[PDB]
Amino acid sequence: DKMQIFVKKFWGKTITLEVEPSDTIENVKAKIQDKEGIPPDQQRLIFAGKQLEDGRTLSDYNIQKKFTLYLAYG
Amino acid sequence: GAMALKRIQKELSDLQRDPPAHCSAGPVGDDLFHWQATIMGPPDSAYQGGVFFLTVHFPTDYPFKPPKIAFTTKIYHPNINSNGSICLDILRSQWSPALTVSKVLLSICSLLCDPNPDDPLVPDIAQIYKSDKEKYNRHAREWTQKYAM
């Protein structure tokens, strides 16, 4: 059930996360806070030019194994 | 635009296989000829921390004609007006079929880091960039916080 995705920080390095398709975008933000300490409310996650809504799941966006998200933090 | 489609699919695939650090982009819906793109303000610029959305409309003669790229996010800049239109030579006379959307987006980032006051699409903002960097950086910072964060 668990799978791996990449999170590319704009102008930055790539984070690797272990997620499940049922994880919400908010869950992913919490995971990014675990590895990087970035608070979720300063995170925006992007995929293929679209901003991901906090309440939806990776499954809802059809995000699969080894896909790459983008992380904006400010 | 089948040959344009094949080249658009290749650029899309290249973005997936080797994600660049300056942009994320992909089709709006099921139409590969219409994309949405996201860039962030270059580091250590007045646009730092902002997320800026752009539209990309490919022509059927692509890659032998440039794509129509416009900002949808509001931005304070002498070469970008309120309609999101960008004054950038590689999008008009200096286009080349060796250019990609990704390379064009990096050039737009370069234009945010160093505006061109000699192509004043917004004369007022261009004058301020020449006259008073402090004021310019303040307004550019404020619009970033207001419209892009």
Swiss-Prot record, chain B:
Tell me where in this chain the UBC core domain is found: 3-149
Q: Which residues form the active site?
A: C87
A GO molecular function annotation here is: ATP binding
Biological process (GO), any one: positive regulation of protein ubiquitination
Q: Where in the cell is it found?
A: Cytoplasm
This protein's name: Ubiquitin-conjugating enzyme E2 D1
Which body tissues produce this protein? Answer: Ubiquitous. Up-regulated in livers of iron-overloaded patients with hereditary hemochromatosis.
* Predominant subcellular localization, coarse grouping: cytoplasm
